[PDB]
Swiss-Prot record, chains A, B:
Shown part of the complete sequence: 501 to 599 of 1447
Name of this protein: Protease
S-S bridge residues: none
Start and end residues of each stretch annotated as Dimerization of protease: 1-5, 49-55, 88-99
Active site: residue positions: D25 (for protease activity)
Gene this chain is encoded by: gag-pol
Domain Peptidase A2: 20-89
Signal peptide region: none
Originating organism: Human immunodeficiency virus type 1 group M subtype B (isolate BRU/LAI)
Record's subunit section: Homodimer, whose active site consists of two apposed aspartic acid residues.
Length: 99, 99
């Protein structure tokens, strides 16, 4: 797809087999979802920095599907105001910024 | 240009005649710089919101240039950890996300 940026670029994503909405966010290094359940082991990861650090769970090699593209990426699971697709997942799907 | 997403997509921009580096950030509604001086009329604007809102100065129709594309946009001036080119400016330059 080619996505213009007059609205927030939210997309439907299937992550670890679950359907969610998430924002295509070129300002975010990492991908993060709240309220999904992923199986297997994870590594704790300290993220954020404002007012303290947030502890989240980092999962490796998680299946992700966006617009028919099935890829694998690192996914953090923890509290987030909205779900974020960061540049880690964007590089897997081959997304570029163009003008 | 076509900008891949393996690193943070910083670009050099000229804003109000002053040369700055800033992040192309499809997760940001607005464009914000710290430590530029803009002339002319501004109004305070409350932005952000998690933890409280941040007060910034909003300037209209500011000249912005990126990779030789001269556009006009709203620019907010106030505290920000990195300067940000948000969706308001990216729609003016015709930037899209593509995969
Ligand atoms: Y929540
Ligand atoms: Y952001």
């Amino acid at each position: 797809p080619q996505i213009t940026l007059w609205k927030r670029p939210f997309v439907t994503v299937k992550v670890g087999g679950q359907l969610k909405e998430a924002l295509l966010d070129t300002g975010a290094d990492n991908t993060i979802f709240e309220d999904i359940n992923l199986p297997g082991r994870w590594k704790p990861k300290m993220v954020g920095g404002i007012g303290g650090f947030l502890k989240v769970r980092e999962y490796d090699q998680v299946p992700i599907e966006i617009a028919g593209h099935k890829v694998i990426g690192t996914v953090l699971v923890g509290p987030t105001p909205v779900n974020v697709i960061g540049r880690d997942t964007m590089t897997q799907i081959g997304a570029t910024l163009n003008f």
